[PDB]
C-alpha cells in the first residue's frame, strides 16, 4: 500500500479506536472525543481539561445536532486539522 | 507523533509530491491528479488511462471551476476515498 493508502486506513482505525469505547459504537460522544484529542493530537492541539472546551469542539464538529461526532463529522475534523497544519508550516 | 498525526502529515506530503510538478505548485492540474491516482491509489482506485476519466474525476473534485484541484478540494477527495474504504469493509 502507498503512504496515502496507509494514511487513509489510519484515519479509519483511530476513529474506531475511540468510537467503540462507549454508547453508540460508531460515533464519538464528547468523552470519546476528548480522549482522542488528548491521546492522539497532543502535538497539534492543546490538552482538553475542561468540559466547556470539549463542549465547544463538539459544537463545531456536530453538524446534525445529535451531540456526537459521526464518521462524516470526523472526516471534517481531520480536514480542519490537516488544513491548519499545512498552513502553519508555510508562508 | 501519533499514528493520526503522521497520517495527517502524509496527506500533506502526497499533495505536495504531485502538485509541485507542473504549473501552479499548489494545485493539482489534471495531469498531476492522474499521476497521483495511478501511483498512490492503485489499491483503492482503478488505473486511469483515458483523458475522459480524469476529466470526470476533476469535474467531481473541482468546486471553484478553475480546472484544478487545490488543497481544500484534495481534502474533500481524501474524505470521499476514506468514506468509501470504511464502508467497503463493514456491514
Ligand atoms: N518538523 C516538522 N514539523 C515536519 C517534519 C517532517 C515533515 O515531513 C513531511 C510533512 C510535510 C512537510 C512540509 O509540510 C508540513 C506541514 C505540516 C506539518 C505538521 N502538521 N506538523 C509538517 C509538514 C513535515 C514537517
Ligand atoms: N525531535 C523532536 N522531539 C520534535 C521535532 C519536531 C517537533 O515539532 C513539534 C510540532 C511540529 C508540528 C505540529 O505543531 C503544530 C502546532 C500548531 C498547529 C496549528 N496551527 N493548529 C499545527 C501544528 C516536535 C518535537
Ligand atoms: N485487509 C484489509 N483490507 C485491512 C487490513 C488492515 C486493516 O487495519 C486497520 C484498518 C481498519 C480496519 C477495519 O476497517 C478498514 C476499513 C477500510 C480498509 C481499507 N480501505 N482497505 C481497511 C480497514 C484494515 C483493513
Ligand atoms: N497480502 C496482500 N498482498 C494483500 C492483502 C490485502 C489486500 O487487499 C487489497 C485491497 C483491500 C482494501 C482496498 O480495496 C478497496 C476496493 C474498493 C474500494 C472502494 N469501494 N472504492 C475501497 C478499497 C491486497 C493485497
Ligand atoms: Ca461511541
Ligand atoms: Ca453529529
Ligand atoms: Ca501543479
Ligand atoms: Ca479548483
Ligand atoms: Zn503547501
Ligand atoms: Zn466503522
Which domains are assigned to chain B? 1-91 (1.10.238.10)
Q: What one-character DSSP code corresponds to residue B47?
A: P
A83:B75 CB<8 A: yes
Nearest ligand 1 atom to the CA of B12 is: 11
Distances (CA, A) of B35 to B10, B42, B54: 17, 10, 10
Q: Which one, of A58, A50, A88, lies nearest residue A74 by Cα? A: A58
Roughly how many angstroms between the first and final C-alpha of chain B, as a whole number?
32
B69 CB-near residues (< 8 Å, 6+ apart): B27, B28, B33, B58, B61, B62, B77
Q: What is the CB-side half-sphere exposure of residue B21 using CA atoms within 13 A?
A: 14
Catalogue the long-range contacts made by A65-70 (C-beta closer than 8 Å, 24 or more residues apart): A66/A27, A67/A29, A67/A30, A68/A24, A68/A27, A68/A28, A68/A29, A68/A30, A69/A27, A69/A28, A69/A33, A70/A26, A70/A27, A70/A28
The number of angstroms, rounded, from the C-alpha of A83 to the middle of its chain's C-alpha atoms is 14
Name the residue of A45, A80, A85 whose CB sits within 8 Å of the most ligand 2 atoms, as the mutation to test its pocket: A85
Query: In this structure, which residue's CA is closest to atom 2 in ligand 1?
Result: A89
Closest-CA distance of chain B to residue A69, Å: 14
- Measured in angstroms, the CA of B25 and the nearest CA of chain A are apart by 13
Size of interface A-B (CB pairs under 8 A): 94
Resolution in Å equals 1.9
The chain B residues in contact with chain A (CB within 8 A) are 1-15, 39-44, 71-72, 75-76, 78-79, 81-83, 85-86
Amino acid at each position: 500500500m502507498s503512504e496515502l493508502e496507509k494514511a487513509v486506513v489510519a484515519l479509519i482505525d483511530v476513529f474506531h479506536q475511540y468510537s467503540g469505547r462507549e454508547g453508540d459504537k460508531h460515533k464519538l460522544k464528547k468523552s470519546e472525543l476528548k480522549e482522542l484529542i488528548n491521546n492522539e493530537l497532543s502535538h497539534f492541539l492543546e490538552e482538553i481539561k475542561e468540559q466547556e472546551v470539549v463542549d465547544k469542539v463538539m459544537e463545531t464538529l456536530d453538524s446534525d445536532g445529535d451531540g456526537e461526532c459521526d464518521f462524516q463529522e470526523f472526516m471534517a475534523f481531520v480536514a480542519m486539522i490537516t488544513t491548519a497544519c499545512h498552513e502553519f508550516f508555510e508562508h
